[PDB]
Structures are given as structure tokens and as C-alpha cells.
Amino acid sequence: SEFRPGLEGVPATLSSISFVDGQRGVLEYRGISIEQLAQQSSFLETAYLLIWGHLPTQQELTEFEHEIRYHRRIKFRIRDMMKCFPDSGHPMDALQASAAALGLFYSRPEYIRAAVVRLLAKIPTMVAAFQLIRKGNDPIQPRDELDYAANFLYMLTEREPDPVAARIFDICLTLHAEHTINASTFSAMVTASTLTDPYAVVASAVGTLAPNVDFYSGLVYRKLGIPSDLFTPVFAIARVAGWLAHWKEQLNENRIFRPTQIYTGSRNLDYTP
Amino acid sequence: SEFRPGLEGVPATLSSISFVDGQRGVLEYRGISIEQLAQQSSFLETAYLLIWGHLPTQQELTEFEHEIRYHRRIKFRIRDMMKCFPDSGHPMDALQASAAALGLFYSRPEYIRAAVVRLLAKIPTMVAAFQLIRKGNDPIQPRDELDYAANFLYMLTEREPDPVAARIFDICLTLHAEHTINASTFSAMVTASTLTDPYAVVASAVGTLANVDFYSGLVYRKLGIPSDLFTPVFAIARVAGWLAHWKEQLNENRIFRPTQIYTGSRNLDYTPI
Amino acid sequence: PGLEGVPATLSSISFVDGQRGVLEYRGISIEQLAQQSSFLETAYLLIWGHLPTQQELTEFEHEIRYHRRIKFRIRDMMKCFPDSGHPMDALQASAAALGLFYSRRPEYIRAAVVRLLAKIPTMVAAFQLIRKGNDPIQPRDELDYAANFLYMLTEREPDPVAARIFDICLTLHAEHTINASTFSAMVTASTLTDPYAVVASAVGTLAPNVDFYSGLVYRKLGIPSDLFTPVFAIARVAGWLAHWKEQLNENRIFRPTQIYTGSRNLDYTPIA
Amino acid sequence: PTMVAAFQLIRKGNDPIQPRDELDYAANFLYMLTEREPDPVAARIFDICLTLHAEHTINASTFSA
């Protein structure tokens, strides 16, 4: 008989998607070094690679980009629900409440193809709307003649940025979008095995997520004009690709997780009034 | 499966020696309560009870006491070797070393009756002797007139006491002679389990060993004994218990044998230096 | 009856699986560890838990080599024993009263292990010679562990090949899991003591399979026929010391309980 | 200097060291105290540092003799 405290060194599944070696430094998403990706690529490229399993042509990329550009705007009942929160909460409580209630509204082959589109589109709008409403003012609407990183930074600032900062923010979003098994990813994989929809899974993963890279991360963020409190929620968009990757293939093996225990306490007693 | 930390609450042995009960205040030395035994009895008359198992007559009592008093003496080889001991070490380590150096001189069906008279007559001489030899003197030698406790006090302080103090000390000794199973008695049991002599048993027990105290401290300080000597005294009495349990483990011969549960590494390679 | 199949601790040091034939010392099977490893390196493994660099092996070897000599009051206390007492009695007295001299009680975790590993074989070799009629022989300063021990015991320094046979037959024994000696070491050490006492009690209770290959390989090298069990203790102290350090972070205590079958409420008269 | 060195050792548990018969005054003393044989340069230096202390005129100790 053996034992394993805190569940260490134990295999849990058979991945394919990312590899790190750590003897010289080899970090690759699906089999490509990190610098070939970080010099001449854009975010939707990386995310199509991660999710779907290959690289796209010209047609399919232009179609994905237009579709994601059509679904960027929030409805009016949802703003009418946000208006009543207290103005003393946090951003992670706002994020769990909104991501959870967005599954009341639309839920029921396209099934796998649309949910990914809405989740990729509407998150940064919600983050920015509550940033404004927390202060007395109104929400700002989205433009239709901009691109992902610059559009988000405008909705937060109401000042239109020059292309250099847009490109820099975009690749700093490229180099965070994946890593291998840790707490949050095991929690998404535990939840998603009872055959559920992506809104509960992301609700639960963002429930448990709440020199090193941190030095320069802090500085290059502080200069672009982003408040302090909004540090960590900026993470959770960069990463929302990783988690969806997993939901797709853990839905293939139809098992359920359940270990057992080693009872260690007082035995056979009797009911004393 | 199951697991208990500290064997805490697992039955280990059978017994017929003592009984305790703590919701009402009951404590029995073979079924004769503590009050009517501390009212008109002495240490030797009890000790016969615990070890052998039934109240004695008068003829045997005379024989017993006469014999445990014609053997209080020692040779010059033990005293000559006692001198080569340091003079800045605790008296407890000297107790252990001397109890384990009795074994060389005396060793190898009246064999379980000689051992008791020897290990019961020959403790006080030696603890007092080291008390004197530590700070530069010569040790006293006992006369054939005084009693057990009277003679201990005379050897320790050189000036005779009055009889009332002797009587009080004899009570103080017949209180501390037994209780239920503890750490030290557990050590003596697991070491006797494989048929070895009584001396080794007493050395390992003393090694393990290093309300009522709140007043015993006072009663001892009054009579003129230092602080360094509060613990060896509490050992003199107690031997009369360890002995008894040795005597018991000899009827069944079955040797203690538990197991473990691992949680370490498995399969590795010796990497060259 | 007799504590069978009952889980007493959680440990990590040695693993043995019977029915399929295996044995490991911290995760490395034994037949791979015998052919390219010496003794002191194996003690270092079984104590701290990680094989060492080059400089650390060097400093351990030197530190051991400087602590083999033995002051003159200890010699002068050994001369009074009698010439008719067993050798295991000499070993209990010696290892128990070596704790009167050096007891301060990781500035006090790394000296004790050094002296305990240094000054045992000297004592067993001396009392051999003193019991016989003549006085002890000092240690050299140009040999290695098993060569030095064999020269102190017999005076005629051996061939290197015999040294190496001795050294691997000294690593074959250093470890094995729960038994009566080891359980008594832990029971003693649970109350937070220092080593010179737990070793005294553990050598108190020790007093074709491999009881046919030991006999002969021992009898050829030139070893008397009574020092058979004491030489075994030289091999085993390593094992025991690991335990005193593992069981010092749990802090609990031992206390099992008993059942009763005796008569109650009798009537007192001392004169029976 | 034999007496001074013998008590320096016995004060510590060990034994006294004996003298050699193939050395000179300052180096011999320094060996009996160290058990490590010294090179001639330090021997000569110690010797002349012993030369320049061996006399002075009337003070307490000399009046007492």
C-alpha cells in the first residue's frame, strides 16, 4: 500500500497542446518556437492555432475576423442590470456575476462554433463598462473602424491611440496566452467532465484564479495609462483562449473524477443527550 | 483503510495489576483501595503485594526485610571507577551509566528472586554517592540500625533526622509507586519482549524518563534536598512498578511487529559526479 | 495479539516489495548502488537525502579523518572493567557514558553525527586488546576506513582487495525497515532527547538465506568468533541516526491503552 | 619550555608530546607546541625577537630577586 500527499507527480490526462522542457528554455504552443510566433503574428492567429488544431488560409482568417467584429456590442437589459450593483464591490465579483448571468440569456455543430465567438467578443466591453459606471458617468460605445487592442484601449480612455502602442500591447498579449497544468486549469477540467456549457466552466475558473516577468509587466503597463485595480482582470482575457482549448478535448473522454480517502478519527460512540 | 496517529486509543496488552477510573476517583493496587493501604502499611509490604501477588504473612516478612539490608554494600572496584566521572554533568546521565554498569559484575530457578533484592537494595547508595563525589568529598557508609527512608536521609545529609520525618517520607514514597501504562512502561515492555535480563530494562527505562507537584515541591524542599535532585528521587519509588511488568511479559512469548506506509520516490539513476 | 498489521508512522526512507523481489535505499535499487559507491557517500544519502557535489564529499571525508583519536580519561576508565564480562555489555556502558563528556544541549546537529560516526570502532578494538592482556594500538593516518579498522584489530595491514570486499559487505546491511530494534529507537526518541541515549537503548534490545555467506567471508578475513554481533552494530548506526532526525519534526508522543481482567473491592489485612 | 608546553596540552584532554633530538631551540619549542615542523625563516625570526628582550635594569622584579 502506498500514498501521495497533495496529489503530486501523478499523471492526470494525455495532453497535446503545449510543451516546456526547462533545461535550456523551450516553450512552444502546438510545436513552434515562441519567437517565430512573437515577431510576425497577431492575436487571432495564435488563438485559431490553439483552439482548432492547425493554421488557417486567407479566406478563413478574414471570415473569422469579420464575424468577431460584428458581435462586440452589449444589449440594453444587461446595462439595466449592471446599473444596480453597489459602487463598492470589486472587479472579480463583477466578473463572476456577469459571466454567470450571461448564460440565462442565450443557452440551450453551430453549438460549438458560436459560444466561442460570444465569449471572445463581449468580455472587454463588460470590464470597461463597469469601470466607468463605478464613477458616476456613462458607458462609452464601440467604434467600427478600429482593431482589437486599440479599440479596447479607446473604450477605456476616450482618446484614440497611435499604431505603435497598439502593436506593442498586442504582442504583450501574445506572450501570456498558455501554460500547462496548474490549479485553475485542473478546476476547469474537473467542472467540464459532467458535460456542461462554457459559461459555468469559465465562472468557476475565474472563481479560483482570484528578474521575473513581473518587473517589466508592471512598468510597461503603468505607462500606457491603465489603473492599478485593473491589473489582474487584464490577465483574464489574454488567457481565455487556453481554457477553451481544454473544454474541447476533455469533452471527448467521457470519464468522471472521484478519488477516495483514508478515514482518521474517533470511532464507535453512543448518543449522550 | 484506516490510520491512527500515536497508536492513540489502540489496545495493546492485557493486565491484572492496577485499575483506574477518573469520573469518580478510583485507583486500585490489585483490588484494595489506596486509603486503607496508605493508612497502616509500608513500602516493602506493598512491594511484596504488587510483584508477587497476595498479602504476606509475618515469617516471610521478617525474612524479606532482613535480607534487603544485609545487602546494601558494594565493592571498591565500583567506587574506584565512580571517581573517573566528570564533575559538570547532570546526575541523571550518571544514574543511567551506573545502572548499566552493574551488569558486568553480576550476570548469568531462584534467579527471579535474587534480582529483585539486588535492584531494590542498591539504588539509593549510588545516587547519594554521586551527590557527594561531584563536589569533592568522600561518600558515607551505612549503619545496621536505621530504616529505609531514615537511612537514605542520613547518608545524604550526615545528620540524623527525627522519627516523624521518617514516617512522612515513607508515605511520600508509597504514593508514587504505580499508575497505568505510560511512555516509560511502554519502553520497558517492548524491550523485555525478547527475553533479556532486568538490568538492561532498567537502563532503557531511565533513559526514556528524562495537583500533586504543587505541594510535593514544598514538602521536599523543607527536608533539605537541592533542586538538581527532584527528578532522581521520583525514580527510586518508581522502579517497584517497572519490575512488575517485566515479570508479566514472560508468560506469553510473542514479539511486537507493526508496519508503515510510504510516500517517497520510485525508480531513479545514479548520476556520475 | 502482538501488534500485527497495524500503521504506526508515515516514512520515506526505504522501500521493499517481497513477492516480486526488490529493495531500495531512497529510490535506487541496491545492485546498482553496490558497484560504484563507497560507504560515507551512502551514509550522506541516508541522512540528508541528496547525493552531494565534489567539495562536500571532500570536506566530510576530512572531518571524519580528524576525529578518530581518544582522550586519556576514557582509556583510564576502561581499565577497571572485569575480565569476565560479555562484549555487548561493554558496548552499552561505553556508548552511554560517552554522553557525560560532550553534551551541550545546525550548530548542534552536525557535530554529534561526526563523533558518533568516528569513535565506535576504536572502542570495540581497544576492549578486545585490553581484555586479552595487552594495551591498545593507536590509529594510523594514511589508510582508509576498513583498512584502518583491520590494522587496529590485527596489526598486519591487509591487501587492498580485502579492504574493498569488506567495504561492500559493510554497505550490504545499513538499512532495513520496521523491526524491534528500530521501534525501540523511535519510542525512546519521541520525547525529544539527544542521540547518545537512543543508541544506548537500541543496542540494549538487539542482544539458503544470508546465514551461510556471512559466516565464511567473515571467518577468512581473520575475525574472532565472538565479535560477530558487535561488528554488525558498526554497520547499522547509520540507519538509526536518520530516524532520530525525522521523528523530531512530528512532536507528538506515544501512549497506547490496556484492557482489564482483575478482581475488585477486597478487604484489607496486612498480616495475611 | 617543556613544562609550559606539557601543561598547555594536558589542559585540553590530550597527552604531552616528546622532544626531538635533531632540531634547535626555537624551532623545537614551536614544534612541541604545534606538532608541525617549521621552515628555517620563522625559526630565525623568533630567535632574534627573543634576543632583544633578555635584559633591562632595576625595576620591581629584579629588586625582589
Residue numbers in the entry:
A (entry chain Q): 5 to 112, 118 to 219, 313 to 375
B (entry chain C): 5 to 112, 118 to 219, 314 to 376
C (entry chain D): 9 to 113, 118 to 219, 313 to 377
D (entry chain H): 133 to 197
In the authors' words:
CS catalyses the condensation of acetyl-CoA and oxaloacetate to citrate as the first step in the tricarboxylic acid cycle.
Indeed, an increase in the pH from 7.5 to 9 led to complete disassembly of the structure into hexamers. This behaviour is driven by the residue H369 in the fractal interface, and changing it to arginine abolished the pH sensitivity without compromising its assembly into fractals. Instead, we solved this structure for a point mutant (H369R), which we generated in the course of a structure–function analysis (described further below).
